[PDB]
Amino acid sequence: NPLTHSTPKNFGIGQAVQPKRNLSRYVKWPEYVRVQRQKKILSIRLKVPPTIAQFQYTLDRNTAAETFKLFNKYRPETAAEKKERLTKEAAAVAEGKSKQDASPKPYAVKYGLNHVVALIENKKAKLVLIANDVDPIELVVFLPALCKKMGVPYAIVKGKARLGTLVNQKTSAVAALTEVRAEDEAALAKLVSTIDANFADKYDEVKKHWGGGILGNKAQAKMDKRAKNS
Amino acid sequence: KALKVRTSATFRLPKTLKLARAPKYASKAVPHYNRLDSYKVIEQPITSETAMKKVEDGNILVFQVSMKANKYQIKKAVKELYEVDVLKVNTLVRPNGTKKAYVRLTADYDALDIANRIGYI
Amino acid sequence: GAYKYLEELQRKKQSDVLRFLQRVRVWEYRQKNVIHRAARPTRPDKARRLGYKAKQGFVIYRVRVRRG
Amino acid sequence: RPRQYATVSKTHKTVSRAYGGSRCANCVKERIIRAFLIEEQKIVKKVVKEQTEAAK
Amino acid sequence: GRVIRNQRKGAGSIFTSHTRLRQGAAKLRTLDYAERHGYIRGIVKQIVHDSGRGAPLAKVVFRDPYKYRLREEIFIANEGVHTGQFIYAGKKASLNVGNVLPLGSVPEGTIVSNVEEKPGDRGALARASGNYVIIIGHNPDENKTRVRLPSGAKKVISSDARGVIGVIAGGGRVDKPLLKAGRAFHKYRLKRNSWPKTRGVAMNPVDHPHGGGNHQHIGKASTISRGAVSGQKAGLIAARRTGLLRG
RNA sequence: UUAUUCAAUGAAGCGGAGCUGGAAUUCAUUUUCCACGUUCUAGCAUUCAAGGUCCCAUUCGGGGCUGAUCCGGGUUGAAG
RNA sequence: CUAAUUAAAACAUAGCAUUGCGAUGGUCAGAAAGUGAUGUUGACGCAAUGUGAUUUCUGCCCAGUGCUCUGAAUGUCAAA
RNA sequence: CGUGGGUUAGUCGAUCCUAAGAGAUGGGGAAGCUCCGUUUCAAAGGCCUGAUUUUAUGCAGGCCACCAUCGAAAGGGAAUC
Ligand SMILES: [Mg+2]
Ligand SMILES: [Mg+2]
Ligand SMILES: [Mg+2]
Ligand SMILES: [Mg+2]
Ligand SMILES: [Mg+2]
Ligand SMILES: [Mg+2]
Ligand SMILES: [Mg+2]
Ligand SMILES: [Mg+2]
Ligand SMILES: [Mg+2]
Ligand SMILES: [Mg+2]
Ligand SMILES: [Mg+2]
Ligand SMILES: [Mg+2]
Ligand SMILES: [Mg+2]
Ligand SMILES: [Mg+2]
Ligand SMILES: [Mg+2]
């Protein structure tokens, strides 16, 4: 096309004004966006003592898929099925009158931090799921030591949001199974086998290993320049 | 993980939805009436001999008006009270703190007839 | 319950656990305002014994004042 | 006076050239010469630079 | 028992800078990618006079790299800089008078002015009229450079700090005598209220530590410690030797 | 270096890794380093960039990619 | 310049000289401060003083007291 | 002294602009009355769409990086003889 021509621009220094490049690296973020990024940085800069970052070894994606597959079968009552089952328990008063036992034993997961800590202490829990992301971590940071001492298998899992999903909350921070249905006993057992393989059996070694000290990209890539030049 | 291309280093506040008010009760429940109607604008004629010299000679109706009335509210009130048309309004605040309006009518009307039609001279 | 463990561990201020947690948190509180709303108590157990309950009406403000 | 220029028409405010009411017909003519003599210099400085790096 | 004139100056009431007629802050161009990896070309459009300053100001106009607009920086004019002159600022720039280059990328014995004490603070050294900076050394590992300041002192500045080649224009100004209190009056009219000066020995003891007595005499030693405070630092502060320089 | 301290900016190009050519006498290995689109002149430089490429559902117009290397989201330099 | 008893030889002055300071600074503010003046500054500058245009000179003194010194390191040396 | 009359503006001023300055906000200090600061270390925002039938003109593009306000009846300023 003889009408159309090729300009090409000289985007060098001191010539031909710069184009609209991406400066997402260079945004002055709002003050909260800096502090929520630099807090995560400052955690992994310092030497994290092993009582923290005995977290961040998390039940991985394939075996946390199995864990939530089992725990979703034992989901607690909603308000929808509770208001229904009280009406059938109303009919227990109306005509049932066993004593008050129109309803069977409910098999549900056990949640709530005070409840679950008390369930571990009486050694009634069969498996505990611990959220890694809770804040303040002081709420949960004693839980692996307690679970190790009472002999309850525990998993540090990702998501207090996800633990809240199976208990119909928004956040749960713990989720325990204290008894399963008899058809799911082998399902729990192979989970218990791998979860102690990842968490409880390493616990005596994880207790010694500090965390953090991870340097940033520039200062890491300047550290190996000093190593190669010396 | 992709991310949005940000051509500006400046982060501005986003444009959130600003809902309108939808109140559960009225603020005052009875609107005030017209705080300056025609009877509040025009109070009385000014009936000095100097104001009477302007009735025939100049075709000006001299009034005493509210201090809160501007030259639009004087013109509007004079028109629909006295069924005239105003050519011009000149207004002064008198040294007794009252507002005096020189209201000149258009040539179709005669301020001498209208002065008798109001009732003064 | 869990608040008994929270109560005793909070007494171990110079423990290696809390000395890290105090270091990370004291940095975060300087990058906020001098007076600013806390979303929830950093010490829920200390909030119970002083009077706080988790219901609508209870408000936490974190605040720093100059020593000396 | 500077607000009177909004009352008069465009003929009083501009000469019929490029850069009419801005520059002064000698600064414009010098601007046209200085424009022209540099791309002809730039074309020459391009073929001088390209040839001398094509050698070695 | 009354606060002295040297103490009252810090309140900054009538003792401020008379800064209405001044042309701006005479700084360097802000250190950016143009001046850190290549150069940028300016143009002098005015050599103007700065009120209260004995050195002319060069208004140098650059193009903004990122937006289509013109940015007018205000330089202190170097002796030899003219109007219509292209001015180069950057690292790859050429040594001419009025060009702005880092101290590392100019050789030994180069004469520079408007020299940054820290890289990017837009000019701090050699800014009064006639003064200059000589580069007397280099330490290329851990990049530094040794200079001679206009006082005669030796300073070590980063090699990424900048400077403008040449002396600051307007030199030889103080070599002219003022001849009269009037020409002192209008020099300090456009600077600040420090003129005239009443001698402290010409005072009452309430006003100055030197005043009073039946004869105008100092009374105590005029040399005072650095370890004194306001109201006692009226004289020679922390002097090493006094009087003439005759050994 | 992450607390702290100094400073600068519309937080715009930082760090690392990638094309060449050699007085690397390639030592069949970047033990290795260097230069990154602009300097006769008081001009001009803006419309997501023309070009190229591919798609649309083509609507006379619209969207990507490349032009303009990739990755790390550490704004950058000090001081500790 | 002593309004309203002192207009002077007193104050100022240019000239001269001394002193401190290269900015993390000198001199000074402020109760503090993410605080100020000089400072829209940078030694031909700023600040602190002394003498007071020009001619011609500024002798002797470091024992005293002040000021100052990368100066001597079991004389004295508080708290921890 | 007693009683009244009298001051009419699009064009004259105020109003608007900034000056030296004063002074909120964000934020820091201070037991506090309040102090500092006036662009700061803030997520600080309105401007036109080319031009209208799915338009109370947006539920869209697109543009803009500054950041209160007060401060002159002698300064600047639309226009009457
Ligand atoms: Mg941090
Ligand atoms: Mg009036
Ligand atoms: Mg009037
Ligand atoms: Mg004097
Ligand atoms: Mg006296
Ligand atoms: Mg920047
Ligand atoms: Mg007298
Ligand atoms: Mg100031
Ligand atoms: Mg002598
Ligand atoms: Mg002791
Ligand atoms: Mg009278
Ligand atoms: Mg007028
Ligand atoms: Mg205004
Ligand atoms: Mg105003
Ligand atoms: Mg004027």
N-to-C order of helices and strands of chain A: HEHHHEHEHEHHEH
Q: What oligomeric state do these chains adopt? A: part of a larger assembly
Side by side, the strands of the main sheet of chain A go: 3-2-4
Q: What percent of the residues of chain D sit in helical stretches (DSSP H or I)? A: 40-55%
Largest sheet of chain D: none
**Please, how many helices of chain A?**
9
- Which term fits the overall shape of chain D? rod-shaped
Rg on CA atoms of chain D, Å: 21 Å
Structural class of chain A: mainly alpha
Largest interface, Cβ cutoff 8 Å: A-C, 24 and 21 residues
Structural class of chain D: mainly alpha
Q: Summarize the biggest pleated sheet of chain A.
A: 3 strands, mixed
SSE string of chain D: H
Counted beta strands of chain D: 0
* Cα separation of the termini of chain D: 65 Å
Our measurement of the CA-to-CA distance between the termini of chain A, rounded to an integer number of angstroms, reads: 61 Å
Overall strand count of chain A: 5
Q: Looking at the structure, what is the overall shape of chain A?
A: elongated
Strand content of chain D: under 5%
Radius of gyration of chain A: 27 Å
Subcellular location (chain C): Cytoplasm
Protein name (chain C): Large ribosomal subunit protein eL15A
Family (chain C): Belongs to the eukaryotic ribosomal protein eL15 family.
InterPro entries (chain A): eL8/uL1-like, Ribosomal_eL30-like_sf, Ribosomal_eL8-like_CS, Ribosomal_eL8/eL30/eS12/Gad45, Ribosomal_eL8/Nhp2, Ribosomal_eL8_euk
Folded structure, characterized:
The structure is cut from a larger assembly and holds chains A (230 residues), B (121 residues), C (68 residues), D (56 residues) and E (247 residues). With 230 residues, chain A is mainly α. Chain A has 9 helices and 5 strands. Chain A has helices at 31-45, 61-71, 79-96, 113-121, 143-149, 160-166, 185-200, 203-206, 217-229, and strands spanning 47-48, 127-131, 154-157, 174-177, 211-212. The longest helix of chain A is centred in the middle third of the chain and has 18 residues, at 79-96. Chain A is elongated and about 90 Å long. Chain C is an alpha+beta fold. Chain C has 3 helices and 2 strands, in the order ααβαβ. Chain C has helices at residues 3-10, 16-30, 44-50; strands at residues 35-38, 60-63. Chain C has a two-stranded antiparallel sheet. By secondary structure, chain D is an all-alpha fold. Chain D is built from 1 helix and no strands. By secondary structure, chain E is mainly beta. Chain E is built from 3 helices and 12 strands. A 6-stranded antiparallel sheet of chain E has the order 5-10-6-7-8-9, with no helix packed on it. A 4-stranded antiparallel sheet of chain E has the order 3-2-1-4. In chain E, strands 11-12 form a two-stranded parallel ribbon. In chain E, β1 (39-48) and β2 (57-63) form a beta hairpin. Chain E starts with a helix and ends in a 10-residue tail after the last strand. One magnesium ion is lined by residues 197-199 of chain E. The site of one magnesium ion (MG) has 3 residues of chain A, from α1. Chain E binds 3 RNA strands through α1, β1, α3, β11 and β12.
